[PDB]
């Protein structure tokens, strides 16, 4: 009942980072403190890693196991967006704002950062555990994918949105909003596929799947807290970002058909402001009048 409308929405949302000129951010970037620039680079690098794996691994593997040519076409399109559009856009931003050495250093930093490695290990592990014709392993990977789309990106998205909302780094911010617009529909779509599998189960099996989903969310959440503190303490925003990730965790649960898990909190209003002619043959009668 939904794939065709998602197909149409995904293809109509198609974009490339080159559509957005980035040289306009040069001055507001220059004006940020060293702490702010550091957090910003690292935040986008963490996002780049997530999209790299979502494009290389997550979306293609889910596409492989989901039945139906139209469902596969949507998932293939989403996969392309992840690595050919989203992951690449971050390099466009980096290449504009930062010198090569700072770019090299931040990519080295992703490799050695323990929270980023842990979250990649956990998510990709679940993708690679999918067994052919085994719907339960597929469900588990789809939960992981929804958590990546609708929860994990948001510790990263906070900062570009926070600046956009203050009228700073607005070209980079425009790119990020386009990425976010895509991930929102990706999270909903994968959520609907996960619910399909969940709804086939016995009540006992469903109870176990909810346990899996909640245990996984809590494990990812605890790691994300440490990641958030590590990045945002130097810019004074860790508590604010934490509220934002809890907000989005609830959206991820809802995408999976589950009740919200965290209590509602006031999000920084700045971040909320951050959101030929046809050829017809001649007839014989055309020559007489």
């Amino acid at each position: 009942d939904f794939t065709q409308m998602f197909y149409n929405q995904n293809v109509k949302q198609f974009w490339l980072p080159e559509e957005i000129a980035l040289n306009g951010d040069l001055l507001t970037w220059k004006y940020l403190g060293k702490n702010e620039q550091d957090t910003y680079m690292k935040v986008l690098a963490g996002l780049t890693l997530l999209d790299t794996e979502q494009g290389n691994t997550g979306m293609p593997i889910v596409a492989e196991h989901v039945d139906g040519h139209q469902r596969k076409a949507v998932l293939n399109f989403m996969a392309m967006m992840e690595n050919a559009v989203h992951a690449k856009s971050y390099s466009n931003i980096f290449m504009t704002l930062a010198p090569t050495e700072t770019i090299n250093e931040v990519f080295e930093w992703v490799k050695q950062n323990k929270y980023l490695q842990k979250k990649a290990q956990m998510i990709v592990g679940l993708y690679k555990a999918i067994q052919k014709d085994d719907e339960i392993s597929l469900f588990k990977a789809m939960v992981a994918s929804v958590y990546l789309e609708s929860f994990l990106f948001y510790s990263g998205f906070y900062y570009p949105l926070y600046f956009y909302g203050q009228g700073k780094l607005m070209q980079s911010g425009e790119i990020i909003n386009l990425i976010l617009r895509d991930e929102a529909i990706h999270g909903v779509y994968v959520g609907l596929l996960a619910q399909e599998i969940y709804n086939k189960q016995t009540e006992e099996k469903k109870a176990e799947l909810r346990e899996f989903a909640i245990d996984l969310l809590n494990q990812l959440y605890e790691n994300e807290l440490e990641y958030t503190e590590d990045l945002y303490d130097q810019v004074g925003l860790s508590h604010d970002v934490k509220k934002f990730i809890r907000y989005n965790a609830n959206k991820a649960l809802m995408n999976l058909g589950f009740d919200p898990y965290f209590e509602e909190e006031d999000i920084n209003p700045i971040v909320l402001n951050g959101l030929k002619a046809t050829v017809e043959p001649l007839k014989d009668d055309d020559f007489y009048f």
Binding site: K276, A277, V279, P281, L282, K283, F287, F289
Partner: protein, 683 residues
């Protein structure tokens, strides 16, 4: 923002559900009193002005020296006595931006409208004070408008030629191709548009002195001409404009058309060269019967018969060419070629379509030659003879290359003044003077044909404006009735003026005695058929103005037979692009494209309502795209029967209609006697 363009933009602000059309009067008033009177150089007396203009190389001393300064003063008083006021901002803006004389640094304004008109009139009269006053009255009343070259350059020292349309016949030789390139660059340097006939050129894969598959075809010459026109671009302000014409039975016709395809390669596509296709009735007959047509190699026909293919009658020699084994021919599908023509016109507006048998069945000078191609504007239809440019040491055989001086009657102002006869005769005199004072010293055939044929083109504009301001729909039969009567009267008075000029000067155009005017066959439909209006509404439009009857046409026929005709061709209806704004008139006899025309000049946006547009005649100003092209074809064919040359006929197509609809319009135009089709404009 300028005050005048701010006032001009208040037209579109709809007050009480209506466009504020009166803002354009305020717009032009503000334009004058805030830009023009400020930037106008004013002298203490006209004598100081004329001395300043002559001394600083702005005017020509020779033509101003034929009048005593009292006569020039009287002429200027006659111009300023009218107290002409531009009715719209666009009229004055176009005049003072395109035709008004400016200082050498393009800083201030030297000529007003009256000054330019007086200078043009003194140039036309050639020493006659009363004739100069008559020309001043004619142009200040805006009954007649000289073409852009004449109106822009009449009496100016550093000027281009007064003629801008030239037609060249290219012979099948490298010497003739080199001379064609040279003459094209020379005429483009003068500012004129050059049309070339490429039908005599042998096709691709023909022999050059017994080595076969050696000729590059007409497309190589097309590339040569395209680069020649790109080179001669006159600063690039108006880049060199050329047109190439090919007979549809030329073997290179498909490659000729492929130069305009969007997917054409850079080694084939031509950009600055318009293309026209000459279609004999034989091709239309072959396509109608769905038979297999043949395109021919021109050099084989020339070798076998001693004449060029386009110099022969295809309707009588096509079967002989097909049956001749020594003639080389290629099989084509005529309906496929027609569909390709329609597709190319839909996608690019090209080629121009000339219906050769429609031109030549009424052509008055077939004894001199048949019309084989049209001009860049696709309305000049005159006999031409190809030149034979030989080696450097040898003498050249100079033929006849077409060129005519353009001039438009303003139908609205002529009809308001009830002055068809006087306007037509004075315009004929002015065009004759422009022909006589033109001397192209680098195009020998153009010069020879200008001296011999003495051809002029007297067009008309504001047909749709006059009809819409008189409550007549363009597609209505009453409009065609008015056009019939008006253009029959214009033809009558142009023939009368030509005969009177021949009687006064004692000379006719070269080879007049073989023309249909001399034999009297031209006047058959005029001495047999009455062209008085058939509707009482139209008949009142001509009240107070004598309409020649069959007896008047018989008297004129006797007068022509006893005195001859001075001009081989007299009437041609050109597009009249930019002078239509100055005259506050609709362009040519074609219907309007937009009721209110929006344009951007520099970083300023301005709107031009059609002349006389209001709420009482809003729906009579029907846009050309919304009307039936069959009725427009009917109107143009009604006008064409009184025009000796062609009419620049633009086809206005909607996006919905297919190539079949364009082909149907073309075939109906051919059926109705349309001589040429200019453009396939799509909205």
């Amino acid at each position: 923002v300028p005050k005048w363009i701010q006032l001009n933009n208040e037209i579109m602000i709809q007050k009480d559900g209506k466009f504020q059309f009166d803002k354009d009067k305020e717009a032009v008033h503000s334009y004058f009193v805030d830009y023009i009177n400020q930037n106008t150089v004013f002298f203490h007396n006209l004598k100081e002005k004329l001395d300043y203009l002559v001394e600083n190389q702005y005017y020509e001393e020779e033509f101003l020296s034929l009048y005593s300064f009292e006569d020039i003063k009287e002429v200027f008083k006659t111009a300023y006595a009218k107290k002409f006021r531009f009715p719209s901002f666009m009229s004055a803006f176009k005049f003072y931006n395109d035709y008004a004389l400016k200082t050498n640094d393009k800083k201030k304004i030297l000529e007003r409208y009256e000054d330019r008109i007086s200078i043009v009139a003194l140039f036309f009269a050639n020493g006659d004070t009363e004739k100069a006053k008559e020309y001043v009255n004619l142009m200040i009343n805006q009954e007649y408008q000289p073409s852009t070259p004449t109106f822009l350059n009449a009496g100016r020292k550093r000027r281009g030629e007064l003629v801008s349309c030239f037609l060249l016949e290219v012979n099948d030789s490298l010497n003739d191709i080199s001379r064609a390139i040279d003459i094209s660059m020379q005429l483009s340097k003068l500012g004129g548009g050059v049309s070339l006939n490429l039908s005599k050129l042998r096709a691709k894969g023909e022999a050059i002195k017994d080595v076969e598959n050696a000729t590059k075809g007409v497309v190589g010459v097309m590339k040569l001409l395209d680069n020649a026109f790109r080179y001669a671009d006159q600063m690039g302000q108006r880049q060199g404009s050329g047109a190439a014409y090919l007979n549809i039975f030329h073997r290179d016709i498909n490659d000729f058309l492929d130069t305009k395809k969007i997917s054409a390669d850079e080694d084939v596509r031509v950009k600055t060269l318009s293309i026209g296709v000459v279609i004999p009735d034989k091709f239309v007959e072959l396509a109608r019967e769905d038979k297999a047509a043949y395109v021919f190699y021109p050099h084989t026909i020339y070798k076998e018969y001693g004449q060029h293919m386009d110099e022969m009658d295809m309707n009588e020699m096509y079967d002989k060419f097909v049956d001749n084994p020594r003639v080389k021919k290629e099989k084509i599908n005529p309906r496929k070629l027609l569909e390709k023509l329609a597709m190319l016109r839909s996608e690019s507006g090209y080629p121009y379509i000339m219906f050769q048998d429609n031109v030549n069945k009424v052509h008055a000078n077939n004894h001199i030659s048949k019309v084989k191609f049209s001009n860049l504007c696709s309305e000049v239809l005159q006999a031409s003879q190809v030149s034979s440019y030989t080696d450097y040491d040898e003498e050249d055989e100079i033929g006849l290359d077409i060129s005519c001086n353009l001039g438009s009657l303003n139908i609205l102002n002529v009809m308001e003044h009830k002055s068809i006869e006087k306007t037509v005769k004075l315009a004929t005199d002015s065009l004759t003077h422009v022909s006589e004072t033109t001397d192209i010293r680098n195009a020998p055939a153009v010069r020879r044909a200008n001296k011999a044929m003495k051809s002029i083109g007297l067009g008309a504009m504001n047909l749709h404006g006059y009809l819409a301001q008189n409550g007549i729909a363009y597609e209505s039969p009453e409009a065609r009735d008015f056009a019939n009567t008006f253009f029959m009267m214009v033809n009558f008075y142009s023939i009368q003026r030509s005969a009177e000029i021949a009687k006064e000067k004692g000379e006719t155009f070269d080879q007049y005695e073989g023309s249909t005017y001399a034999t009297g066959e031209y006047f058959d439909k005029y001495v047999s058929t009455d062209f008085s209006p058939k509707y009482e509404k139209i008949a009142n439009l001509f009240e107070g103005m004598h309409i020649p009857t069959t007896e008047d046409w018989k008297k004129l026929k006797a007068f022509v037979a006893e005195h001859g005709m001075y001009h081989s061709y007299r009437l041609c209806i050109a597009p009249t692009g930019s002078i239509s704004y100055v005259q506050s008139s609709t362009a040519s006899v074609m219907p309007i494209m937009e009721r209110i025309e929006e344009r951007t000049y520099g970083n300023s946006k301005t709107y031009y309502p059609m002349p006389g547009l209001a709420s009482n005649n809003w729906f009579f100003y029907k846009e050309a795209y919304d009307m039936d092209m069959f009725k427009v074809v009917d109107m143009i064919a009604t006008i064409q029967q009184h025009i000796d040359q062609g009419i620049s006929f633009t086809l206005f197509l909607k996006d919905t209609m297919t190539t079949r609809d364009l082909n149907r319009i073309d075939l109906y135009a051919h059926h109705r006697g349309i001589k040429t089709i200019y453009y396939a404009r799509t909205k």
